Design a protein around this ligand. Structure first.
Ligand code: 82O
Lengths: 228, 13
């Protein structure tokens, strides 16, 4: 029934809001708080390692929130441990990149980072100009689409609940959940006259994979660097 | 990625 679909939509939105670190209202409010040129130079002078240490700690923190998101989804806990993990491995980082568009401000090309917004220059110490620049462009594109909270919640749900991931044991159960999500999302897109938006999405697979690699590089080589 | 997996396992349990 139509009412049943709506229960699913509200439920997915509930769980997404519950597992966002800051409420979207708060992110928008704090757009005004902007790093001064001196604070920017503060970050720019840090060592490569220190900057990646901080960045990876935040990448990690976001992934954990994405895991919480999955826990609160309708059929996800019912899946076997193997499946829960397979889906999170394949999709968690991509979810993190989508959730990031919320914290990006398109007006001034700046991003929430550790209490205040600042530009791309804030991350010079990381050294990976091509990668950082791409993460900015990706977020810029998503912002241009003006995804609402509901659209992000449902789309990120579908990023996780994908039935074609190699390694899944209970493929059918996962199809059941994915199909119900595509049903609810399709209905929501129809009522809001937003059917075409998913065509406009920029590709996120290569980018998320690079972020995962950087996160892993830091865990592997921690003994070579200072205690944290 | 195995690094990602470690974070996820811990978070789940
Ligand atoms: C609300 C909240 O708790 N946070 C919002 C932050 C945010 O999404 N910021 C942001 C957005 C777009 C863009 C393009 C860049 C950034 C930094 C969120 C955050 N802080 N730090 C990072 C890593 C991402 C990595 C930066 C990247 C250039 C390597 C540091 N992150 C994101 C979550 C992984 C915490």
């Amino acid at each position: 029934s139509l009412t049943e679909i709506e229960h699913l939509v509200q439920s997915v939105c509930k769980s997404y809001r519950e597992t966002c670190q800051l409420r979207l209202e708060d992110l928008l409010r704090q757009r005004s708080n902007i790093f001064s040129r001196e604070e920017v130079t503060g970050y720019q002078r840090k060592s490569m390692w220190e900057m990646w240490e901080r960045c990876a700690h935040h990448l990690t923190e976001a992934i954990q929130y994405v895991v919480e998101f999955a826990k609160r989804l309708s059929g996800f806990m019912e899946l076997c441990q193997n499946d829960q993990i397979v889906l999170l491995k394949a999709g968690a980082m991509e979810v993190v990149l989508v959730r990031m568009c919320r914290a990006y401000n398109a007006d001034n090309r700046t991003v929430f980072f550790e209490g205040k917004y600042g530009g791309m220059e804030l991350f010079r110490a990381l050294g990976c100009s091509e990668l950082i620049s791409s993460i900015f462009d990706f977020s810029h594109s998503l912002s241009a689409l003006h995804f609402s909270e509901d659209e992000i919640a449902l789309y990120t749900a579908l990023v996780l609940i994908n039935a074609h991931r190699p390694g899944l044991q209970e493929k059918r159960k996962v199809e059941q959940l994915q199909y119900n999500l595509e049903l609810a999302f399709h209905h929501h897109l129809c009522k809001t006259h937003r059917q075409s938006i998913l065509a406009k999405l920029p590709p996120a697979g290569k980018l998320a994979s690079l972020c995962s690699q950087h996160v892993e590089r830091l865990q592997i080589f921690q003994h070579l660097h200072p205690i944290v | 990625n195995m690094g990602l997996e470690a974070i996820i396992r811990k978070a789940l349990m």
